[PDB]
Amino acid sequence: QWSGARALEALLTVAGELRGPPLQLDTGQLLKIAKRGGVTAVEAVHAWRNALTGAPLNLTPEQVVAIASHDGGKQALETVQRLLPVLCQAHGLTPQQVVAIASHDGGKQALETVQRLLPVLCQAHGLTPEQVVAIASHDGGKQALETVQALLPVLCQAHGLTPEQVVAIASNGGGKQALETVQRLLPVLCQAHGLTPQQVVAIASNGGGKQALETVQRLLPVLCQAHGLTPQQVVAIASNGGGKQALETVQRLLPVLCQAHGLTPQQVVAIASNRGGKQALETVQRLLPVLCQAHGLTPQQVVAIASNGGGKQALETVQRLLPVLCQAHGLTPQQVVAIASHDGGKQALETVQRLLPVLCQAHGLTPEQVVAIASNGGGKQALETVQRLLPVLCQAHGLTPEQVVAIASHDGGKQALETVQRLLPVLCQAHGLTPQQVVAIASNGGGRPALESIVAQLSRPDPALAALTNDHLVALACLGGRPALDAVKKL
DNA sequence: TGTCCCTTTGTCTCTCT
DNA sequence: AGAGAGATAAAGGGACA
Ligand SMILES: [Mg+2]
């Protein structure tokens, strides 16, 4: 017979007993745990399902799932029940912070290292506990913490990095490798190539890590001589999303794209410069002539779809759904291009196809409103929240559908809608803001933390804002959100 | 196999002018 | 607002006992 047959059975046997109390996990949850944490993780959840739910820890099932769904999830669960009260009472961490640290592969290692190193990192090195939590909250957190402890002096002193930059480099997966590589390659990339320490930090952080830095070192000349790129444009490729893979693939595909399709290097860099750039470039070389045939899409439209994180997925989804959305939903190609030209375009596209008729018929929105909501990053999230929350926001809070669509139509619209739902009563009833003022604050990117900042100030007034009226705070929040408020706090 | 650590890619949210 | 930066997740490889 088959090996895993015994294992899979034990899996299902215990998995079915977890749909009961006190956890009640759905199929999705149960699979996710099975997939990343394994059988033993599923058993551990079961075996420790009462100790984690109730007194003292009182963790949500969602939080138990978060901790369980990684390699060694069994170990993280055991370690959490042991160290969560230690870390909260002895180091002043929130339980949310502890879960954050535990919710990665090798979670046990990270928790124990935090317990062992947070004192010395704050006292001897002057890091905040927040910074320590951030370093610890990725796979290999233990390694990143040990490496920060060890190289913070030499990085700040012999290499001129601020502690902030060091923390920023460290707070990624492979943090250890990024730090060690930055130590070695900073002088090389600085003195030999005219990059600033800042630019090096950017290559090292955000995923690029060691591979991006070594690939910038290796390939920067081959790119700025023959291919005639600026260092600026090389840094941009390696920086965000990037990195190594995008850089290697820009060498391969820069001519093929220009020569045969007539894209500028400018356009190529923009496609290159996201997470999965390599994938994006490739799908473009492959798919562009297919999208622009039969008087179809324009090059510039193909370039714009491609130039966001997951561009490959948006491209393939566009190629696949362009017909059905135009034919059976009445959308113009231009609209479809707008929906797709943001991070997660694939998701927004699929969610528009799925929910446009529902939001139109059941909720009385226009197709234009649905497109506008979809045409932002996280478009799927905003669309699903509008569907869920429109009736309550309108019926229970007095908002117009127009107002709800306005809150929804920015990056993080989901967060903004959920927060207006939470805080509208206390802002208006308890502090006398008008609904329109609330809607205004919330109708920007970052509407959620703008709203929270406002509530903080009116419920636990910082003296440093008291010279401003509600109306002035409101104007400030609309103008530049939380950052503006916090910047005022400093004055 | 279970665990730890690293890399790539995709998605979502917020910032900075 | 449009571009950059930061957060978080998902999934696979290497390594080791
Ligand atoms: Mg982008």
Numbering used by the authors: 231 to 721
Paper text:
Transcription activator-like (TAL) effectors specifically bind to double stranded (ds) DNA through a central domain of tandem repeats. Each TAL effector (TALE) repeat comprises 33–35 amino acids and recognizes one specific DNA base through a highly variable residue at a fixed position in the repeat. The crystal structures of TAL effector (TALE) proteins bound to their respective target DNAs have revealed that the residue at position 13 is the only one directly involved in DNA base recognition, whereas the 12th residue stabilizes the proper loop conformation. dHax3, an engineered TALE protein, proved to be a useful scaffold for structural characterizations. We then present fifteen crystal structures of engineered dHax3 variants in complex with target DNA molecules, which elucidate the structural basis for the recognition of bases adenine (A) and guanine (G) by reported or uncharacterized TALE codes.
When the natural TALE codes were discovered, no code was found highly specific for base G. In light of the structures of the DNA-binding zinc finger proteins where positive charged amino acids such as Arg, His, Lys play a critical role in the coordination of base G, we made a dHax3 variant with an Arg34, His34, Lys34 in the 7th repeat. We then attempted to co-crystallize these proteins with a modified dHax3 box element whose 7th base is changed from A to G. Four complex structures were determined at high resolutions.
